[PDB]
Design a binder for this molecule. Structure first.
Ligand code: CD4
Ligand code: BCL
Ligand code: BCL
Ligand code: BCL
Ligand code: V7N
Ligand code: V7N
Ligand code: V7N
Ligand code: V7N
Ligand code: V7N
Ligand code: V7N
Ligand code: V7N
Ligand code: LMT
Lengths: 179, 51, 48, 271, 39, 60, 59, 38, 56, 54, 37, 48, 39, 49, 40, 56, 38, 56, 48, 38, 39, 48
């Protein structure tokens, strides 16, 4: 019993019910793989994913909104923080993560770009970021990093798994039949 | 053959209770045989080209 | 007697009673037209 | 039997219909409400296909054919001898194809995934629905659908294609073929690219994402992204089915003459 | 909904309306019988 | 001979090649997540799971 | 009576009902296809007038 | 989702259903005079 | 019988019921429009004696 | 009955409504296209004049 | 929840049985119009 | 009389009215074809 | 739903309604029998 | 005797008894109509005047 | 459950009374039917 | 009414207008495709001259 | 939605709906004078 | 003997056995239905002397 | 002899005996109708 | 679950199965009189 | 299930019911034989 | 008599019922064909 889940009934093939809070214990869609605890490296032995402040040769293409200083609207339609720094992939130039400072600051969390949607599919005014996967309160329980400048593959899985697991566990309604 | 009196169909000397029909497959379809058999009822082979 | 109406909205009763009476009166009127043949025998006189 | 990492993912929730009653796994398969609905329609449809074979002249697999009704029945349910069995099987297929898509949506919801697979599958279902539902309704008879037989439905395609004297001149068919051919070329390129990096020249280390982008820029001057190739493959494969559905639905319901004659508009431009 | 007190007065009006409607219908069928008997 | 012709021979050669190829690809499919876990013990389908494959990484 | 320990009664019931529905529909559909038992059209005939299938005679 | 609003909704729903059926009954009777189907 | 709505959502019931009724009404109207006897757009003005009847 | 402690009454009635609706449509459609019971066309015939398969 | 099941069962049983009786009457009306046996 | 306990009077009256409405309409159609009443009287008034 | 006191009074109302419905129906068949006997 | 009714709802018994009686009386009335031929012979007199 | 020993005892009384009254009334209907058209 | 507390007036109004416009276009095009009510061509005919479906 | 403007909206919706049906009834009256369909 | 159940679990063998028996039974019933001699739905009431026999 | 009813629901027994008796009486009545030919000969006397 | 409920369920399952078989037997006997297949 | 005491009491009623049903059925076969003997 | 121990008495009787009911139905079919009983008595009553 090291996975913190119990079978529903004694019939085999039955689904597991998590015992605690599946977001943090990593069960079901919140599960992560035990990847290597070392940062990914580019072709020249440098960290693959780094914040822009560590490499000033990167910039934002013209005609693309600068998401820094923009509000982060969570699944509650309540602002969960503000984007302050971008994490980019140097092997293939692309935004990978957003760094969000909470409303009462005192901490910074990461937000994968795959869960970020823009208003009107990015066609009309882009004044905020949409995060449908997690609530504003659970932004505070996103796993943190060991260092402020590089991210290993182990934690990379943990942040992505935590957000992806919130499409089933953010609210009780999301884990229930529609009819 | 048909019974002269009752009108019943006789099969191998035994009358049948009911209206007898000859069984057939879907729309009277018959499985194909050899590829040469495709040319029975067809016109014969065409004459040589005028060159 | 009156205890059958307890808990019932008087508007709902009158709206549902009017629906019954209107549709029933229309059906029996069409029923009565066909039996007596009233509009036919007078329409044909004015259209002769 | 389960994969070595599978146990922690087998959790409840994510279904669209039902609760713990239909939230179990039969062997490797996940059984939902739409898993139960799939089995019902698959069993009913397959048994009626076997019955249609038994009614026909042969048990040969290639020669079995369940044909649609005559055009004179015109959107009615024909006698089961005369094509009504084809219509019943068509309903079972539609129910099974729809249940399969909804069962896939339930599985992705349980795994915290996107909804791309059900909608990608819906492109194939749309093409099938155009062939047996939409186009026959526009033409006014269920008998415009194709028969259910391995080589019988090839005869239907041939004769329908020649109903327009040259089906190669269909403008939507030309586009749909290009989508199919480009998809096969792109899939070969993508499969080779991943395998060549992961299985490189013997004795050398496994390549990186830079190696792919550098290689295709060296060969062609442009390298689509790692996400770009998967977006393109989805677009090419699904767009092939969508353009196929368009190409067949315009033949008859909209264009009735030969397809070569359609190109009059290009030859009569004022210039 | 209605309480017991108001349902007693509602029933009083409702019964009076039913009787008056039936009385008018009775005269209607009476006048229709002389014009064209249906039996 | 008479019934046997070149197209049939080529078709059956292709069938044998395809079945061999499918066996090889199914062997490659079992390089992750195997052997299967069951209450009765370890399980492998046909084809059996292949030997462990190791990659090569660039030095740091 | 111990079969319900090794199998979920809820799931066996659903499987059984689904199987019976498929079987019943298949048999009704086969009979509707047959000439003798196409009851929607010829159900009013007596057994003496009902179709009987036979093979072709020798001559 | 309370017994109070379930009673208020049911009164209007029943009347609306009741009204819908009678208009269909009048429509069917009107069509029977025009062209009976039995 | 108001307790039914404590089980089923009135929003989802009405929307599902309205959708089914509209689809049913369109199907029946289309079936009659495709028939010989009740193709009311074309014949319409024929009396019940002159309306088509299927073969006996 | 305790059958409703095993199956959800809300879900059973929804699935039962769907099955009966589909069954009723299939039977109505089978009869509608038959020679004997094409009531839209031949509904005014008497039982003696209605077609009989033979 | 065992008491609410008993009360629902009465509604479901009555509705199921009343529906079959109504269908039996419709089948009786169809037999008068055009018997199928 | 104890059979009425726990039963809503409105549901019982709505189930008696539904029974009586559908039974009276069916027997009226049954009686119309037996007596032939509307047919003979309508043919009298529509023989003009 | 109802109680024993509520059902005792209801049963009295229901029986006098069931009864009275029968006599008026009995007159209906008596008048119909004089008009067109059905045996 | 009276213990056969233990643990049962009186309304389920009355609903099932009504189902039995209504379905049975419909079958035998159809049975009786075809045997006596009652509505046929009476409605034949009244539809020939 | 429902209809305990006391309730079932009184219910069985009203059931047997109703069953007999149904039988007697039906017997008269069969007697009247027999005089009109005997079926044997 | 209390129904507007259940359904959004904007969603209902847009859906109802969209349904009515589609329904109106369908009916107008069904009559246009018919023979009796192809009013753009035969609209000047009197009711006696307008086409009628066959009495067969 | 304060439930009070719903009454305000309901009056406008009912009048607009009933007014549209009356106008459509006049259109069917005019079309009947031109070419009756029964 | 019984130790085969210590090698194959009773549940899996039973499901496979039931599935194989059902498929075999349907295949044989359908094979006979497609034959001339044993199309019992159609001939059925013919005696064994009247039943079809394949050509010699 | 009574020890066979041990641990069995009496209401289940009566319903299963009711199924048996009802279905067996229906099959034998149809069996007896064919043998005696009762309704046939009486139907012919009244529908002639 | 418990053997107490495994005895209750099996009683209704067997009676339900027996009831289903009997009605099918009656149906097959009815069809045999109307149109026998042997 | 059912106890020892009520297993016998049920069996007594079942035997009486089974016997009375057979005798009543015996009279029906007696009357049917004088009407149409089946041998 | 040690063959009964460890066996369910209901399973024994329910398995004897299946055996006896199915065998008594096979032989009643067998006996009807051999004696021709319903055939000859049916033909006496159904030909008059
Ligand atoms: C190319 C190379 C590779 C080619 C091959 C590629 C293969 C790809 C797939 C790979 C996996 C295959 C193996 C597999 O699926 O194993 C499942 C099972 C082990 O399952 P498990 O792990 O023990 O089960 C877990 C769990 O479900 C436990 O639940 P429980 O034990 O309570 O099971 C309850 C189920 C089963 O009960 C049943 O009654 C179901 C019986 C199904 C089979 C028989 C069908 C016919 C009778 C139907 C019932 C009759 C009344 C009882 O109850 C359920 O309800 C489970 C879900 C069933 C489906 C949903 C409900 C459908 C309802 C409507 C339709 C009804 C039927 C028409 O193991 C076996 O069955 C062992 C044998 C496996 C090999 C296949 C053998 C096939 C033999 C026949 C071949 C015929 C060829 C034409
Ligand atoms: C040749 C064939 C015959 C004919 C033969 C029959 C026969 C026979 C029957 C029907 C039945 C039905 N037919 Mg048809 N029918 C014909 C032509 C039509 C036409 C048409 C366009 O001409 C239409 C619209 C219909 C429509 C209908 C339905 C109204 C009805 C029920 C269907 C059903 O089961 O739904 C199921 C789907 C649902 C979603 C069910 C919804 C819930 C229902 C409404 C709840 C009922 C509760 C019940 C009344 C409560 C009783 C209380 C107790 C009395 C106390 N018929 C022709 C003339 N039809 C069936 C029926 O039930 O009739 C009564 C039936 O048995
Ligand atoms: C053979 C068929 C006939 C014909 C038969 C009909 C019939 C019959 C009708 C239409 C209708 C319409 N037709 Mg057409 N129509 C023909 C040819 C045409 C042609 C054409 C180019 O030939 C056109 C463009 C149109 C166009 C139109 C639209 C104006 C309208 C359908 C849309 C709609 O609902 O609008 C909405 C347009 C409006 C003006 C709606 C106004 C609504 C407001 C809310 C009224 C408020 C009243 C007041 C405020 C409140 C009173 C409250 C209480 C009652 C006191 N018709 C031919 C000749 N047409 C329908 C219609 O609605 O007609 C009026 C209709 O029923
Ligand atoms: C003389 C014949 C004509 C002609 C006549 C036609 C006609 C007529 C049609 C096409 C269509 C197509 N033609 Mg062509 N065609 C010709 C020559 C060609 C040539 C060529 C090299 O010359 C090419 C490349 C093509 C290419 C194509 C495609 C664009 C298209 C077929 C794909 C498709 O629709 O997928 C769509 C995919 C599907 C329909 C599959 C859906 C599958 C469903 C959803 C799931 C099934 C699951 C299954 C039952 C599971 C089984 C069990 C499991 C295995 C266990 N044509 C000639 C000139 N062509 C077809 C088309 O566009 O169809 C829409 C079509 O009907
Ligand atoms: C074969 O079918 C075919 C051919 C068709 C043959 C047909 C056959 C059949 C079977 C026909 C059936 C006919 C029938 C039988 O049921 C018909 C039944 C008719 C009946 C019952 C009519 C009843 C009418 C009642 C009326 C008009 C009452 C009006 C009341 C009014 C005006 C007062 C309102 C004001 C109030 C209350 C004050 C509020 C106080 C308040 C708010 C306060 O105080 O708070
Ligand atoms: C050949 O032809 C084929 C086709 C093949 C033959 C086949 C035929 C078949 C199978 C037919 C089937 C027919 C069928 C059954 O299945 C048909 C079933 C029909 C039904 C059920 C109709 C019912 C309609 C009811 C309606 C519209 C109710 C409307 C209510 C309204 C508007 C008021 C609601 C508003 C409220 C409450 C607001 C208050 C809110 C409040 C107070 C609050 O907010 O609190
Ligand atoms: C040739 O044709 C082919 C097709 C080929 C031949 C084939 C034919 C075949 C195979 C036919 C099969 C037929 C079949 C079997 O499968 C048919 C089976 C039919 C069945 C079982 C129908 C059952 C219907 C039941 C109904 C309608 C019940 C409704 C219940 C109601 C209304 C009460 C709800 C009460 C509520 C909600 C109150 C809640 C209170 C609460 C909550 C409270 O108080 O709290
Ligand atoms: C043609 O061929 C086939 C069809 C085969 C031929 C065969 C046909 C067959 C078999 C027919 C069967 C017929 C039949 C028998 O079964 C018919 C049986 C009919 C019956 C039983 C009718 C009963 C009617 C009862 C009525 C009207 C009662 C009304 C009571 C009222 C108004 C009082 C209401 C309460 C009030 C005012 C106060 C409440 C107190 C409250 C609320 C309080 O205290 O709070
Ligand atoms: C084609 O021909 C074929 C068909 C082949 C030929 C074959 C035919 C065959 C075989 C027929 C079989 C017939 C048969 C079987 O044997 C018939 C058996 C019929 C029977 C048994 C009828 C019984 C009717 C019982 C009635 C009416 C009882 C009513 C009682 C009432 C109303 C009181 C209810 C209680 C109340 C009000 C208060 C108590 C509550 C209390 C105290 C509380 O709440 O506490
Ligand atoms: C040419 O034609 C082709 C087709 C080719 C030839 C055909 C060939 C073939 C292969 C035919 C196959 C036939 C076959 C296969 O074996 C047939 C097998 C049939 C079988 C097994 C039928 C069994 C049915 C059982 C039923 C219906 C049970 C119902 C039970 C009920 C209703 C009770 C439920 C309620 C409960 C329990 C409540 C208590 C709960 C409690 C107490 C609680 O909760 O505690
Ligand atoms: C075509 O050819 C073909 C025709 C097929 C040729 C046919 C051939 C064959 C082989 C036919 C076989 C026939 C047969 C086999 O033997 C027939 C077998 C018939 C049998 C056995 C009938 C037995 C009936 C038993 C009855 C009626 C008992 C009723 C009991 C009652 C009423 C009491 C209920 C108890 C109570 C009330 C006390 C509750 C106490 C409680 C709860 C408590 O105290 O707790
Ligand atoms: C099999 C139905 C498939 C339903 C799936 C698609 C949903 C859309 C439903 C479209 C329904 C069309 O409705 C269909 O109209 C045709 C028109 O000939 C009717 O056709 C039948 O009756 C008409 C008159 O009634 C006859 O003239 C005609 O020869 C006969 O085939 C069908 O009985 C009816 O089913």
């Amino acid at each position: 019993s090291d996975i913190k889940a119990v079978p529903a009934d004694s019939y085999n093939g039955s689904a597991l019910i998590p015992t605690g809070d599946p977001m943090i214990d990593g069960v079901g869609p919140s599960s992560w793989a035990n990847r290597s605890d070392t940062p990914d490296m580019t072709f020249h032995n440098t960290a693959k994913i780094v914040p822009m402040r560590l490499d000033p040769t990167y910039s934002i293409a013209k005609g693309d909104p600068d998401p820094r200083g923009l509000p982060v609207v969570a699944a509650d339609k309540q602002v969960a923080g503000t984007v302050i720094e971008l994490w980019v992939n140097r092997a293939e130039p692309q935004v990978t993560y957003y760094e969000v400072q909470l409303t009462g600051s005192e901490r910074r969390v990461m937000l994968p770009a795959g869960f970020v949607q823009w208003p009107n599919f990015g066609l009309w005014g882009n004044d905020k970021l949409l995060v449908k996967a997690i609530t504003a309160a659970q932004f505070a329980n996103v796993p943190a990093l060991k260092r402020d400048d590089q991210i290993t593959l182990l934690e990379e899985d943990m942040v992505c798994a935590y957000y992806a697991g919130g499409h089933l566990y953010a609210m009780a309604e999301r884990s229930e039949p529609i009819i | 053959p048909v019974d002269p009196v009752t009108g019943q169909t006789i099969i191998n000397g035994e009358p049948v209770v009911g209206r007898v029909f000859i069984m057939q497959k879907t729309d009277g379809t018959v499985k194909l045989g050899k590829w040469q058999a495709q040319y029975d009822g067809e016109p014969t082979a065409p004459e040589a080209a005028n060159v | 007697m009156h205890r059958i109406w307890q808990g019932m909205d008087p508007q709902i009763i009158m709206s549902g009673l009017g629906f019954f009476l209107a549709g029933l009166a229309l059906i029996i009127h069409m029923w009565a037209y066909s039996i007596t043949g009233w509009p036919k025998y007078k329409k044909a006189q004015y259209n002769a | 039997a389960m994969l070595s990492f599978e146990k922690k993912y087998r959790v409840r929730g994510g279904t669209l219909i039902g609760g713990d009653l239909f939230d179990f796994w039969f062997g490797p398969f996940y059984v939902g409400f739409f898993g139960v609905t799939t089995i019902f329609f698959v069993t009913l449809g397959t048994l009626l296909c076997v019955w249609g074979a038994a009614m026909g002249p042969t048990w040969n697999l290639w020669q079995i054919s369940i044909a649609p009704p005559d055009l004179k029945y015109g959107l009615g349910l024909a006698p089961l001898r005369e094509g009504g069995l084809w219509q019943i099987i068509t309903l079972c297929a539609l129910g099974a194809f729809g249940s399969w898509a909804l069962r896939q949506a339930e599985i992705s919801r349980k795994l915290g995934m996107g909804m791309h697979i059900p909608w990608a599958y819906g492109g194939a279902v749309l093409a099938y629905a155009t062939l047996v539902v939409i186009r026959p309704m526009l033409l006014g008879a269920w008998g415009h659908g194709f028969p259910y037989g391995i080589f019988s439905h090839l005869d239907w395609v041939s004769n329908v294609g020649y109903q327009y004297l040259h089906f190669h001149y269909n403008p939507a068919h030309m586009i749909a073929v290009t989508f199919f051919f480009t998809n096969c070329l792109a899939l070969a390129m993508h499969g080779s690219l991943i395998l060549s990096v992961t299985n490189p020249k013997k004795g050398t280390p496994v390549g990186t994402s830079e190696t792919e982008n550098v290689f295709f820029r060296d060969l062609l001057g442009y390298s689509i992204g790692a996400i770009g190739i998967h977006r393109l493959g989805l677009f090419l494969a699904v767009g092939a089915a969508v353009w196929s559905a368009i190409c067949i639905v315009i033949s008859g319901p909209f264009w009735t003459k030969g397809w070569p004659e359609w190109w009059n508009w290009w030859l009569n431009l004022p210039i | 909904g209605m309480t017991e007190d108001e349902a007693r007065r509602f029933h009083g009006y409702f019964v009076t309306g039913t009787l008056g409607y039936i009385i008018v219908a009775a005269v209607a069928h009476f006048l229709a019988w002389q014009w064209r008997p249906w039996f | 001979m008479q019934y046997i012709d070149g197209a049939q021979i080529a078709l059956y050669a292709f069938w044998l090649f395809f079945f061999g190829l499918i066996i090889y690809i199914r062997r490659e499919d079992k390089r992750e997540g195997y052997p299967l876990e069951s209450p009765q013990g370890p399980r492998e389908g046909w084809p059996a799971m292949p030997e462990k494959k190791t990659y090569i990484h660039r030095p740091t | 009576h111990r079969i319900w320990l090794m199998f979920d009664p809820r799931r066996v019931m659903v499987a059984m009902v689904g199987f019976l529905a498929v079987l019943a529909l298949v048999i009704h559909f086969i009979l509707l296809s047959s000439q003798r038992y196409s009851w929607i059209e010829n159900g009013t005939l007596s057994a003496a007038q009902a179709p009987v299938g036979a093979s072709a005679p020798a001559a």
